[PDB]
Structures are given as structure tokens and as C-alpha cells.
Amino acid sequence: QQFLSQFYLNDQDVYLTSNVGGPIQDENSLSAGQRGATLLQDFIFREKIQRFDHERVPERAVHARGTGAHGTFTSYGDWSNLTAASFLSAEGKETPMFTRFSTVAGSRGSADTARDVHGFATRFYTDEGNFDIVGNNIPVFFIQDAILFPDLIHAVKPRGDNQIPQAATAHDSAWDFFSQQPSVLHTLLWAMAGHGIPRSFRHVNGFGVHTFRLVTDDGKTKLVKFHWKGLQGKASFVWEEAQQTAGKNADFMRQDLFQSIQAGRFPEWELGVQIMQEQDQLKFGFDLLDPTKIVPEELVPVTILGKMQLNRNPMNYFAETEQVMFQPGHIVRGVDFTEDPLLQGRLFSYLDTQLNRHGGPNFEQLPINRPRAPIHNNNRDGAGQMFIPLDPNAYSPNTENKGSPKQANETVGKGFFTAPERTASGKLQRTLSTTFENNWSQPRLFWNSLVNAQKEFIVDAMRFETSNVSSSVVRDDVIIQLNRISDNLATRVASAIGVEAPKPNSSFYHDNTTAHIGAFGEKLAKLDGLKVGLLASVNKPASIAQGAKLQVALSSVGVDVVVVAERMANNVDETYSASDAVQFDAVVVADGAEGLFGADSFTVEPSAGSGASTLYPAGRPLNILLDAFRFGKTVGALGSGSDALESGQISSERQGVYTGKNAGDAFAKDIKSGLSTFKFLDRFAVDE
Amino acid sequence: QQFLSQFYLNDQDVYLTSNVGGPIQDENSLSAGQRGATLLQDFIFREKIQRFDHERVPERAVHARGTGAHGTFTSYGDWSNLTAASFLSAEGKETPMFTRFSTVAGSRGSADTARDVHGFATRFYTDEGNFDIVGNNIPVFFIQDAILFPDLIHAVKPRGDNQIPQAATAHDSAWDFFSQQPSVLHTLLWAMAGHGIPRSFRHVNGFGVHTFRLVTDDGKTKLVKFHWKGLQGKASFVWEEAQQTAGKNADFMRQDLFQSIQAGRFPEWELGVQIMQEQDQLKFGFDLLDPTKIVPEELVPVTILGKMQLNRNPMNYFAETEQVMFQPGHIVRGVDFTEDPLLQGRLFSYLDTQLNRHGGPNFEQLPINRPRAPIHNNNRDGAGQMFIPLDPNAYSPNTENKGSPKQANETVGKGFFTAPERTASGKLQRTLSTTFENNWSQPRLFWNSLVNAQKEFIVDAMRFETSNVSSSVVRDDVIIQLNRISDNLATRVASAIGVEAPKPNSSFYHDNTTAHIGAFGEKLAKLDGLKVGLLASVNKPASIAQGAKLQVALSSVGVDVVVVAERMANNVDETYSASDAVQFDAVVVADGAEGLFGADSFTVEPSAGSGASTLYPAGRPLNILLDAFRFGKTVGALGSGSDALESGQISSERQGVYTGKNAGDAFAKDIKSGLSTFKFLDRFAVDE
Amino acid sequence: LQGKASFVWEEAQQTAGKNADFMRQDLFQSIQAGRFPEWELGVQIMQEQDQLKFGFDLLDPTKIVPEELVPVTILGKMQLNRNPMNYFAETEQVMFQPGHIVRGVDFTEDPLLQGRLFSYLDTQLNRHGGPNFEQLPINRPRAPIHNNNRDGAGQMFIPLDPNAYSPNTENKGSPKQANETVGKGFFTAPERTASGKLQRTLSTTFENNWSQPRLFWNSLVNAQKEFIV
Numbered sequence A, B: 001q002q003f004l005s006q007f008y009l010n011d012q013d014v015y016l017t018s019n020v021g022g023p024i025q026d027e028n029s030l031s032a033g034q035r036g037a038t039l040l041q042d043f044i045f046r047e048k049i050q051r052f053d054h055e056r057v058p059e060r061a062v063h064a065r066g067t068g069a070h071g072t073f074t075s076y077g078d079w080s081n082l083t084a085a086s087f088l089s090a091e092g093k094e095t096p097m098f099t100r101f102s103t104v105a106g107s108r109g110s111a112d113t114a115r116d117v118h119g120f121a122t123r124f125y126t127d128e129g130n131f132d133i134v135g136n137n138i139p140v141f142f143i144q145d146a147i148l149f150p151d152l153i154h155a156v157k158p159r160g161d162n163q164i165p166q167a168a169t170a171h172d173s174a175w176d177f178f179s180q181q182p183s184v185l186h187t188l189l190w191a192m193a194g195h196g197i198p199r200s201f202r203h204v205n206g207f208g209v210h211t212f213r214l215v216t217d218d219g220k221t222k223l224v225k226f227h228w229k230g231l232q233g234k235a236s237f238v239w240e241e242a243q244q245t246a247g248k249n250a251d252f253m254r255q256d257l258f259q260s261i262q263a264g265r266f267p268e269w270e271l272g273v274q275i276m277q278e279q280d281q282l283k284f285g286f287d288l289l290d291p292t293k294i295v296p297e298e299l300v301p302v303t304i305l306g307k308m309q310l311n312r313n314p315m316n317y318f319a320e321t322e323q324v325m326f327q328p329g330h331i332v333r334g335v336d337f338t339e340d341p342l343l344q345g346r347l348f349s350y351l352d353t354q355l356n357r358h359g360g361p362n363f364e365q366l367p368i369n370r371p372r373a374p375i376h377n378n379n380r381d382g383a384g385q386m387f388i389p390l391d392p393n394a395y396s397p398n399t400e401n402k403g404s405p406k407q408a409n410e411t412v413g414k415g416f417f418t419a420p421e422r423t424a425s426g427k428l429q430r431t432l433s434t435t436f437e438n439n440w441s442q443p444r445l446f447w448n449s450l451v452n453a454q455k456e457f458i459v460d461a462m463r464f465e466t467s468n469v470s471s472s473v474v475r476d477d478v479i480i481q482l483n484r485i486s487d488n489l490a491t492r493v494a495s496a497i498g499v500e501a502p503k504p505n506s507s508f509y510h511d512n513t514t515a516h517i518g519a520f521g522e523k524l525a526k527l528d529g530l531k532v533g534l535l536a537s538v539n540k541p542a543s544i545a546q547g548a549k550l551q552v553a554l555s556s557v558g559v560d561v562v563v564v565a566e567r568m569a570n571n572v573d574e575t576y577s578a579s580d581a582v583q584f585d586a587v588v589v590a591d592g593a594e595g596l597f598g599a600d601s602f603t604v605e606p607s608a609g610s611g612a613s614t615l616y617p618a619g620r621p622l623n624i625l626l627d628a629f630r631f632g633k634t635v636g637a638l639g640s641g642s643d644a645l646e647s648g649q650i651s652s653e654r655q656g657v658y659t660g661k662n663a664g665d666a667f668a669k670d671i672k673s674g675l676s677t678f679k680f681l682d683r684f685a686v687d688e
Numbered sequence C: 001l002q003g004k005a006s007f008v009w010e011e012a013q014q015t016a017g018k019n020a021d022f023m024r025q026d027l028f029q030s031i032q033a034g035r036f037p038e039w040e041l042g043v044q045i046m047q048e049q050d051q052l053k054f055g056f057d058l059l060d061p062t063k064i065v066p067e068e069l070v071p072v073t074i075l076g077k078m079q080l081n082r083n084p085m086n087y088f089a090e091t092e093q094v095m096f097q098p099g100h101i102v103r104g105v106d107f108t109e110d111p112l113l114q115g116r117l118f119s120y121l122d123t124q125l126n127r128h129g130g131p132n133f134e135q136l137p138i139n140r141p142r143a144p145i146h147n148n149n150r151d152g153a154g155q156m157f158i159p160l161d162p163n164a165y166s167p168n169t170e171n172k173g174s175p176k177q178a179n180e181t182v183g184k185g186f187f188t189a190p191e192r193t194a195s196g197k198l199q200r201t202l203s204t205t206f207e208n209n210w211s212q213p214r215l216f217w218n219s220l221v222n223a224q225k226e227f228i229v
């Protein structure tokens, strides 16, 4: 924090000043008499309002909705026989980082829990330059050439005439594009499985997507896939829960991250690479240059390089998070590109687009973008030039500055260099590689590898989405494409949307799998930051007292208990009015609160004699319990709190429903078991 | 449409071209061989991606989230004895209009149904210049001096460190500001009543807020308040239903307006003025220069001037709606300003801020900002200069261009003029007028004038919001200020939030009222665009058939029937999966569908033997009915469909619950009666 | 078609002091007087196989092709005949690009040309302050525009197609792809190839920096040699 603290403005106990250090007041405009017109000579007014009028900058063209944190990387080894990268040069070597997570399609201010691909962008402030791995939470992307990006994004984003719908693929154009461009199918399945609706940014993995090169000082290369393996564990929602979260808390995932860091529950990921040889580009049966293809870990294991920990929130979101400007072109000696046509064109885009955002060329001079390494070059001027170059002779080769700055390359000065054995051959052409043409086998691989419930979640997502596609031509074209993945998938979706069941096409059908590829099916590794909503009553103080007791039994695993009651009495954390099932990973009815959960509570007429509360909507306590159950959450009840389960027609005989005598260790153990499972999949119907 | 049509690009059945008219292809980057690197000389790639990279412009600093429509104004009179404004010069005189509706705090992707003040910005493209009345759906504003705008907005918008929470006042800073700056209280009560959460942009009124001057050709003035009196009727949600809508359809109100216009259901408002004398500024017990004060209609009635109808959607949202740049400084001869310090400073802000949005000075040259009147002046150059001035001598006074362009003033050329009897007097000063100091009497007026349910809505909003305020000091400060409005209001709110019940402070208490000031309590004037969701089943074809029958009996009042079923069969409009109570103004169970509404349906275990549907979440049909009921909506059932009411513990004896033998006229009449009432207020508990 | 004419240095200096606008004024006045200056467009036509045969590299922008080796074939004539109405709007804002290319012309691997292509698209963002510089009157084409590019500050058009992507069915597959065989599309000369290791190097074919300067020097009348000295 040494570096960024030089730019901090501390406004504790100080007098107000203009931006040029003149002390001022700023609460009344200068007027001609008490009730007079405002004077033009009021510079205090105009400077204040001019700053205000110009606060905004263009949102990012994609990934506009996102959230950042500072952290650190630790290398596990001296990787010099693999890469010349300085940040990987020794066991225990540490490098600062900044990471931003995001959705893709929605604008600023859109819901965190929209269904989408998620950005997972990681900057290493290395001692040999900034290195960015600008990744996502899904290892494959929709399209195979960067020139198609505007097509994909215009189709996914809102209609051009009326700008509907926000942050959603559930409209004709998106599905038109997906069916017209079947390369999209692999990412589409990932996003419509649990990966499109994660519980938090701490409960996803990251991926660089593209094949990159690692290169040693002597020019030897390997091809790699970059991975960020999360140490908390994958966790995802079901769609109806993600929708409800969008309505109750648009900031749900950004808030989770912020709070977890404030609580000292620092999320971690291991940096890994699947290490391959130059000769492996086509040998696996798909092209390593094709960003729609994964390398299954059965074919190439993930070699772990080191660990990222996120551990400090920004001081000012705009200055740090909004203004961070990631680029795949932020590359360092020891890494190089490949001819993946999607990567190739990204390189252009991310340098250009910062001109839009920053409004000029000196965006690398913003504190969050600056390197932690010296800058010496002949670049000059531009709007917003914050440095003062001492060299008046800004050219090479010079004698007037004694030949400095000096050229750095592979042999001197630790320069960047292109892997020296890379070659080009062939006619200059605008063509789609024939090696890129199997759009369906890997989608099928993914589909085969999912637990039954998560197959169902894909079907139900596609049914929801395509039922909102007005065009019969598009609906039919979607089914025809899905059928090339799996006749089962296609048939199951078709039945909701008025499309004839398709005949099988066996061209790409196969039964191979890859392990643990879905969002569902594994227990969490860490329970840190999960929440238990304890539904209590101010009329039974002992019910509220159970919060602290339960908390003592859950603190050692980083789980918080939130006491919910009718009003803010002592030791109450939230009111029923302010609460919703989507706030809580588990919901527990406290002993003595059961009287709030009557089955008639949704519809009883709130006459003056009725006893109906004005402190919350009719039925709210029972709505929270029922929504928690239906969404698949851990549900519990203490003592006579179990009567509330009976009112809700929830049997403790069901999986993920727990009762206990009191809030001690025995019950906490069972709630921990529930939270580790995270979602109880037997509450979802599956096609037969 | 003739004017804007000159800028249309029709892309039906044509070849792709670059932006300089060279035919192109745009689907494959140019590569060095089939699997080669992308070439720099690929200008097609770069022009496409550069346009993409630079698509975004800064969102509006406030009112970022909004929706536009074209329309027309028709004057009802020759108003020349009141104002010289040309658009008001004759009975029948038509002027084109563009109107944008918005929230205030949220960024451009935030939910339509956030609770907020709403913008209501109307441009008249008059034959003597663009005239903009940049208003809101609430007649009073939070603050009394424009210099305070960054304070108000920084407090309401997300926290500076983490940018939480989106589009919400339910956080410490906002309530800190409201309690520290009690001028805020009038608008706060309006926004926490129904006016904060309207059903649609068609179901609100508009207000200019400030007092303005109307001025005749001979310099005579009146003071006025501008009104837009809606002809559909006020209609608003309850908080829980606004939240649910945010989660299910972030575009709900934008969609409503687009659809209503495409249906020919054109919304209308009458422009009106409260006409006052110069000598009335301090006569009524408050200052007409104070924008936190209404003029009750009992004191000065609204004189109706003419009518706005909105009747055409944009062709391209970005080009038209996103780029429209309103300004109160877009004033015409016949109107003038007052010394309201809020208005005074607005004039500076809206000219300045377009520089940010447009990135240069020529924003009035965008098609949507152009006038429909001649432009002739000596302004020159600037980035993005779209015109070519023929006069090379761009100064006055000139002889080299024969004294042209010629000065226009009161007596020649129909120039703008400041009302000539306006004066200034007094010492130059930065002070708050003593006439502005009663922050509490008018909030009490507003409070007194509400039906009991809407008082409860204000209480319940403030309890929800302030329960989210962490600071005890802030909570107490809020209660102190509320208590100066009404001890009842303050006491009712305090009891939810752990603040001691305040003792009365009666300085500003009174019993006066003003009529029909809330959002609740009157029947709707028109039912256009309201929706009845008919919950049917594909397994009972006759249930689906009731849709068309009911539709026939409701078409004449502009109400649509939407048939909901399990899957998209013939005559089904939506699936259950895709549906929610919040989509429908009334919900009706079709005869034959009752089997879907079992009371065990939320929690039944969906095993192979259970017959649980995979086509929708467990309990969805009953959830839609129960939500509709709890939210206050018209609910009904046809035939045996009434069994579903029983399952949901909904009695037909309750108000706004209707049973019918069949889908004929009698039942249609009951549904129209329910829609007219709109919300059944007896379903909400009230304090005692 | 007027003829080469030049100053001596001391005369050019004196002109800078007396009339900074001397050449701009000459052009403006000549056009106002109806004395329209003309140039003939010509090409030295060579074969693909001629890149190195002349003893210097055709990709090297420091080398001329002497007209003794390859004559100038005259294609047509330019006449300049109308001054701007507003200098800022027309002259200051004109934004030239070598990337403004049409079917029937293509690039070569001259490393100076290659990078120019990037620069002239980028730099207009600085000048115009946004992406829609081709919409300025002086930059607009006299030919239809139909594409899926959208938005950006200063968007002067209103696209009617709400489905701005390919491939689409929602707009019936339009705008349609144009290439060598359909729609008169631009196309890269199809026999061009690449070969070799990716590298940052100076071609050895570019290394004679002095023979052509000497050719030029030898070809001057004595006075003009003196003027160089």
C-alpha cells in the first residue's frame, strides 16, 4: 500500500478548499441580495458544479458491472526452466495484484446476479512490468475470431430500437446469433449450467481461455492454458433464486466480497498451467488455437505455480476499480502470444478502448494503472501528461542523450521477445480454419459430465430463455443445433417451446466425460462468509439469545449468524421487513419464534382486531422459510421452532432439513454439514 | 417524422460497407495463412473494432436510467394575453415533442422499479426555438440551492469506497443528509409514498417544480407553476412488489411505454399552469422562490393550456433517447426565470454537462437536439462541426456581411428578453433566505392529505430504509426531524428501529389538507395497457380457450389477456416458468387449471413417482396467485378454478376477489371494476 | 502541368517574414481567378517479380524507381477548381487515411506503409475527440453506407436495423457480406503469401543508404548542387 498511499487524500478534520487550495465554503450561491439572482462571478459555485457535471466516464463496452480488490501473489517455485517471467523466478517471491470480477452484458448498475459469463481479470504488478491475465470464470468463449465480437455483443445486448432487455440473453437476437453461429454452444452450456449464476466471486474459478506461450531465457517454449483454481469451492444458484436476489440486492456479490475482506476471510486461488508442447496444437483432436475448446484435465494436468490472495478493498471505488484498465497486451518477458484469432484481435481492442474511457492517451499514468517498476522511454506529451521528462532529445538513435534509453531485447536489458521459433506460412487470407469446424463434440463432453440436476438446470434455463424468443424460425434453428449436441437435450428443451421433437443426428454424439466440470456436485472446501439467518421474535427474548450461542459454535469456520426479528430490539441484526431468503445460505427458526409462521399468515385480513403486524408484509416469516426450502438451502429449527416447519409443510425427514434441542455444538455440526453440501438437489424435478 | 427521417439508415437487402462506403466482408480477420497471426494491414478488422471499442458515452450524471418517446403538443387556445410563447399562440397549434422519463440515482442498467424521484423531461420543438421543461413526477425538490446538488447526490448515490448500494436511499449517507438538511423532508415523503414506485410512466403526473415567469410581448408577467396532468390516472406499487419487479423485469416500465405506443394506446397529459401575480411571492405563507413548497390547488387552480400525446417510439435508442440533451436554458420568448436559487444554478449545469456527454461543444447539432426553426449565428468551429458556415466574417457589428446576422430583441426579430421589470437590490451575499426556513409544515400538509393506507406505506418505507442505517446518531436525528412533521409519523417509524418514542414538538403541527395529493385513493381514468394473466393448463384445452373469450370482453377498454400455461401450446402466451405475478395487473385462474394449485405444491418431493413438473419451479402457479393477492391485485377464478382460491386460502368474500361461471361479460365487468380500483388496500395492516 | 518552380533559401526566409500565408494565398487566388491547377495521375507499372531485380527493394520507401527503368503510364487528370466555403469545417477537419482503399488496389509489405495504416485510423480519435469522424461532411463518402457499426459519441445517423449483427435472420441476412466474387467487396491480392520466422529485424535488402542519394546528386544542374551544399 506504500505505492498507492502517495495519492491518498485524507479529509479527517480539515477545512474545505477549492481544487487549487483556496479555503472556501460551498453551501450558498452568491446572490444579489437575500432573494436575488445568482452571480456569474461565483467561481465557488461553478468549480463545484463543473466537477459534478463531469464526474462520469464511459462505462466499459463489456464487463461494465464489476468489482475489484487488492491482493498479493506468492510463487511456489523457481519456474525458470519453464518461463523467464520475473514474478515466477523464486520460491516465495511475492508480487502485488489487483483483480476485478464482472458480468459481461449488463450496464453499470445492472444486477450482480444476472445470468452471464463472468470476468476474472488479474493484474500482477511485477518488477519487470505489469502483467495482466484478462480471464473469465468459463474456460471457453463464444466465438473463434475477434472480428466477430461486435456481432456477438450486439446480439446479446439490448435491442437497438428500445434498449430491452437489460443484462439478458432471453431475447430473439441472442438466440438468433447462437443458432446461426454454433461455435457459441460450448460457452452457452457453461453459462446456462450453474457457472452463469455463481453464489459469489469467491466461489468460482478463473481461466485465461486462450493458449499462451511460456518462454525461457534461451527461447524454449511450452504452450499453456492458465487456470485460477479457487480454494473456497464452486457454488451456484438456481435461476429463480438469482432473479429474486437481483430484486432484493443488486449488489449481492460485490457486497459478499467487500464484507469477506473486511472480516479477514481472504479468498484465494492457485495459479496453474496445463503445460503442453508446440507439437500438441492439433494432436488432441481439436485445435489449441480454438478458444471454444477446453483441454480436459484427463489429457493434461494442471501444474500449480503459486497462489493469489485477495485481501484489501479499495479506498475509493471510482479511482481504483472503475479506472483500472486491463490489457492482454500488458505482457512481460517470459510469456508470448499464440495465433488464436480471438486473442490476436483482443490485443488491438484493449489498447484502443482505454482512449474512450480515459478520454486521452495517458491512461497508464493513473495510479491504479502505473507499474511498480521504472518507466524510461521516448513517448511524449498527450493530454493529461502527469510526468515531466528531463530528456529533451526523445529519439533513438541519439548521441545527444548518450544513446539512452537503450534498446532491450532477448540478449540485453531483459527485453520482451517473441518466441524466436514462431513462423508464418501460407497465403494471406480471410478464412475460417477447417480445424475449427467441430462446434458440437465438446458441448456434448460438457453435458455428459454433469450431475442429473445440473443437466436439468441447463434444460430449464434454455426452456425459460427460448420461451421468450418470438421467432419460430429462431426457435427451430436453436433446436436443430442443440440436437447435434444431444438428442436428449434438444428434445427436453423443444417440449416447452412448441417445436417438434427432432430426430437424432449421430454425427457428434459420444459418451466421454471430464471430471467435476459443472458448478454442482462437490462439497465446499471452506464455509467462510456464509450466512445463517436465525428467524427469531422480540416477544421471546430467549429466541434472540440463540443467535450469539449459535454464533459461538460457527465462528471457527467463518460462518455468520444474522438475527432477524420484527423490530430492532437488542441483539437483533435485521428486521423481517428488510430480510429475504436470498440473504442467507441457511435459514433456521429459533425456539419460540414459531408463532410467526402460521399457514394463514399470507391471506388473513389485517383488521384492527386481527393482530396482523405492521412491521412486515403479511406472511414474511413463513415466505422466508418456504423460499429457503424451495431454493434448495439448508433449513433448520430449534426446539419448538420445529412447529414452523410443520406450518410450512417441511418435514425434517427431508435431506437438508435439520432440528435440534438447542443452539449448541450438536446442531451447529449439522448446519455445517448442510452448508458444505450448499444446495439440496433432491428438491428439483428431473425429466424422465 | 419527416425531419428525423433524413438521418435514417435503411439496411434491408444491401451489401455491407465500411463507414466510407467501400463494400466489405467482416467475419474473418486477415491472417498469414490458415492458422496464422492477424495482420496490421487489416483495416476492416480495425475500423469495425475501433467503432465497437468507442461505442459508449458517459451516462447522465443523474437520471441515467430512462426511456424516451416522440409525440405532439396541441394548444387549446391563443394564450397571447398570458404569454408571447409561439407554441401557445393559437388554438389547435401543433408542436413536435420528445419526452424522456427516468429515475434519478441509479446508473443506466439499474432497475426501472427502484424507489426514486422520477424525471419527466418534455421538449417542444417550437417554431421559435427548442423549449424544454425539465421536470419530475413530484412537484417539490429536496434542496433549496443548486450549489447543494453534489451534496445531495453524493449522499444518495453509492458509498465512495465500495459503490454500494445501487439505486437506493436505504443507507447511512442518504439518511444522514436528509436529517442534516431537513429541507429534504417534503420530497422525501412524496418519494416514500406511492410516487416513488409508480406502475408506469403513463400513470404519473409531471411538474416543472420551480416558479417561472410567463411574459407577454409588452412585458407583463405572471408567476406560474407548470403541471402535466396525466389522463390515464395515478397508479403505484407497494415496496415488495416494486422489488420483485426489479428482479423479474428490470425493463418493466420502459417495456410498458414501448408496448402501449405500438398498440396505439397513446398516453396523454394536459399542460397546465397555476397562474399567480408578482405580488404573490410571499403572500401565501411560504416563498414562491422556494422549490420545496407546493402551491395547493385550493389556493390557485391549474389553468389548462393544451395537450401532449406520446405516439411514436424511437427507431434507434442510442441515437435518439440516449443522446437527447435537455436544458432549462432552452427557453423561448414569452417565458423567463425566477430567482429560485435551485433553478438559477441548474441553468449553468445543463449547458456544461453536455460537454462531458458529447465530448465536445456541438451537441446541439445531433439530430435529436436540432431545432425545427432557422439557425443563424456567429458561433464557429468546435470538434464535430457538422455545418459549413458560408459567412467568413463571423462577428458583429459588421459591414463585410452587411450587418447580418441581425440582433433580435423585444421589439425586432422576436428576440428573447428578460422580463423588464425584474430588479436586483441588496448586498452581495452567500446566505440562506430566512423565508426558506419552514422545512416541516408542508410535509405535514402532504401527510395529512393521504388515505390511511398510504400513510402506512410511508411509515413502512421509512422503517424498511432506516432499519438499514447503521449509525445510531443518524437514526435518532431522523426521528427528531420526522417528529417536527408529525409525532404520529415519528413514533410509528421509531418503533421499528430501536429509537425511543419522541415527545411531541408541536411548532409546525396543523390539520390542513390538500385534495388527491397521494398516489392512492382514486380510481383509474383509463385501463389501457393493463394486463390480465389467465392461469391455464395445456391438459384442459377449454381453460386455454377462456383467454380469447375474456379478451373479447376486455379489448374495448385496452386491456390484454395473457394466457399462461405449462408449455407453449396453441394459444398460450407465456409459460409458468417465464411468468410472475408482477407481470399482471389482475390474475385469474382458468376453469380446469385448479389442479396445478395444490397447497402441497411448494414442498412436495419431486421424485420419479410424484408427477412434479419439470416445466416450472415447484409451486409456481400457486405462488403467482398468492403473490397477486398479497400485493393487492384483482384476483379471480372461473368455474371450478375457484378451487385454487381455496387451496390458497383466498376467500371470494374479500374485496377484489371475483368468481365467475364463465369468461363472459359479467365476469369481465367485475375484472374491469377491480382494475379500476387497481389496488385493494384492505390487505395491508395499519398501525393503531 | 504548371511546372516545377522553387526558391533559394534567403528568399524563402524573407517570404516567411512578409507573408506567412504566401502559398495558401497563391492557391486560393489562382482558383478564384479561374487558373485551375492540374496534375496527371500516373503509375510506374511493374510485375510482382520485380521486387529485388532493379538492385534495390521495391518495399524500401527510401528508393525511387528511375523513369529510365520504368516509365510513368498516365491514367487521368486532377483539376483543382473550388476553394472551401469554411476552412475549419472543410480543410481543418479533413481526415485522410491510407486505409481508405477501394477494390482494385492493395497494399505491399513496405514496413513504413504497413504501420501508417494503424496510425491514420487512430489519430482521428485525437483530432475529432470520438469515433464518428467519418460522419463529418468532408469525410463522408458519395456512396451508400450499410453496416453493423453502432453508436459512439457524435452519432449523426439513426440506424433503422435494431439487429446489428451477422449472421442474422431477424434482418434477413442483411447487410450482406461482399468479397471478391459477390457484392464488389474489397479483397487482398489472393496470391500474396507470408513465409519465415516472426521477427523484429531490418531487412538486409534495405542496407544501401547512399547510392540513390548519389544518383540524385549526380542528376542536378550545378546551381542546384550548390543549393544543397
Ligand code: HDD
Residues within 6 Å of the ligand: A060, A061, A062, A063, A066, A100, A101, A102, A118, A119, A120, A121, A134, A135, A136, A141, A145, A146, A147, A149, A208, A209, A210, A291, A324, A325, A326, A342, A345, A346, A349, A350, A351, A353, A354, B049, B053
Ligand atoms: C475484440 C474484442 C474483444 C474480445 C474478442 C474479447 N474482449 Fe474482453 N474486452 C474488450 C474486448 C474484447 C474490450 C472492449 O477491450 C474491454 C472493455 C473494457 C476493457 O478495458 O476492455 C474488455 C473487457 C474485458 C474484461 C473486463 C476487465 C475489467 O474488469 O476491467 C474481461 C474480464 C474480459 N474482457 C475478458 C475477456 C475474455 C476472457 C475474452 C475471450 C477469451 C474476451 N474478453 C474477448
Ligand code: HDD
Residues within 6 Å of the ligand: A049, A053, B060, B061, B062, B063, B066, B100, B101, B102, B118, B119, B120, B121, B134, B135, B136, B141, B145, B146, B147, B149, B208, B209, B210, B291, B324, B325, B326, B342, B345, B346, B349, B350, B351, B353, B354
Ligand atoms: C445544479 C445541479 C442540478 C440541479 C439542482 C438539478 N439538476 Fe437535474 N440534471 C442536472 C443537474 C441538476 C444535470 C447534471 O445537468 C443533468 C444530468 C444529465 C443532464 O443533461 O442534465 C440533469 C438531468 C435531469 C433530468 C434528466 C433529463 C433527461 O431525461 O435527459 C431531469 C428530468 C432533471 N434533471 C430534473 C431536475 C429537477 C426537476 C430538478 C429540481 C427542480 C433538478 N433536475 C435539479
Ligand SMILES: *[C@@H]1O[C@H](CO[C@@H]2O[C@H](CO)[C@@H](O)[C@H](O)[C@H]2NC(C)=O)[C@@H](O)[C@H](O)[C@H]1NC(C)=O
Residues within 6 Å of the ligand: B409, B410, B411, B412
Ligand atoms: C431593440 O433593437 C433596436 C435596435 O434598433 C437600433 O437602435 C439604435 C438606436 O435607435 C439605432 O442606432 C439603430 O439604427 C436602430 N436600428 C437598428 C436596426 O439597429 C433598438 O432600437 C431597440 O431600442 C432595442 N430595444 C428594445 C427594448 O426592443
Ligand SMILES: *[C@@H]1O[C@H](CO)[C@@H](O)[C@H](O)[C@H]1NC(C)=O
Residues within 6 Å of the ligand: A078, A079, A080, A081
Ligand atoms: C533447470 O534444469 C536443470 C537441468 O535439469 C537443473 O540443473 C536445474 O535444477 C533446473 N532449475 C531449476 C530452477 O529448477
Ligand SMILES: *[C@@H]1O[C@H](CO)[C@@H](O)[C@H](O)[C@H]1NC(C)=O
Residues within 6 Å of the ligand: A407, A408, A409, A410, A411, A412
Ligand atoms: C540485442 O540488442 C543488443 C544491444 O542493443 C544488440 O547489440 C544485439 O545485437 C541484439 N541482439 C538481438 C538478439 O537482436
Ligand SMILES: *[C@@H]1O[C@H](CO)[C@@H](O)[C@H](O)[C@H]1NC(C)=O
Residues within 6 Å of the ligand: A285, A509, A510, A511, A512
Ligand atoms: C472418447 O474420446 C476418445 C478420444 O478421441 C475417442 O477416440 C473415443 O471414441 C471416445 N469414447 C467415447 C465413449 O465417446
Ligand SMILES: *[C@@H]1O[C@H](CO)[C@@H](O)[C@H](O)[C@H]1NC(C)=O
Residues within 6 Å of the ligand: B078, B079, B080, B081
Ligand atoms: C386579449 O385581451 C384583449 C382585452 O382583454 C381582448 O381584446 C382579447 O379578446 C384578448 N385576446 C385573446 C387572444 O384572447
Ligand SMILES: *[C@@H]1O[C@H](CO)[C@@H](O)[C@H](O)[C@H]1NC(C)=O
Residues within 6 Å of the ligand: B285, B441, B509, B510, B512
Ligand atoms: C391552514 O389553512 C387555513 C385555511 O383555512 C389557513 O388559514 C392557515 O394559515 C393554515 N395553517 C397552516 C399552519 O398551514
Ligand SMILES: *[C@@H]1O[C@H](CO)[C@@H](O)[C@H](O)[C@H]1NC(C)=O
Residues within 6 Å of the ligand: C177, C178, C179, C180, C181, C182
Ligand atoms: C464470397 O461471399 C459469398 C456470399 O456470401 C460466399 O458465398 C462465397 O463463397 C464467397 N467467396 C469467397 C471468394 O470467399
Ligand SMILES: [Ca+2]
Residues within 6 Å of the ligand: A145, A341, A430, A431, A432, A433, B028, B029, B031, B034
Ligand atoms: Ca482465420
Ligand SMILES: [Ca+2]
Residues within 6 Å of the ligand: A651, A652, A653, A654, A655, A656, A657, A658
Ligand atoms: Ca433431514
Ligand SMILES: [Ca+2]
Residues within 6 Å of the ligand: A028, A029, A031, A034, B341, B430, B431, B432, B433
Ligand atoms: Ca441564497
Ligand SMILES: [Ca+2]
Residues within 6 Å of the ligand: A627, B627
Ligand atoms: Ca416470492
Ligand SMILES: [Ca+2]
Residues within 6 Å of the ligand: B651, B652, B653, B654, B655, B656, B657, B658
Ligand atoms: Ca369478492
Ligand SMILES: [Ca+2]
Residues within 6 Å of the ligand: A359, B359, C129
Ligand atoms: Ca474528449
Ligand SMILES: [Ca+2]
Residues within 6 Å of the ligand: C111, C200, C201, C202, C203
Ligand atoms: Ca523489418
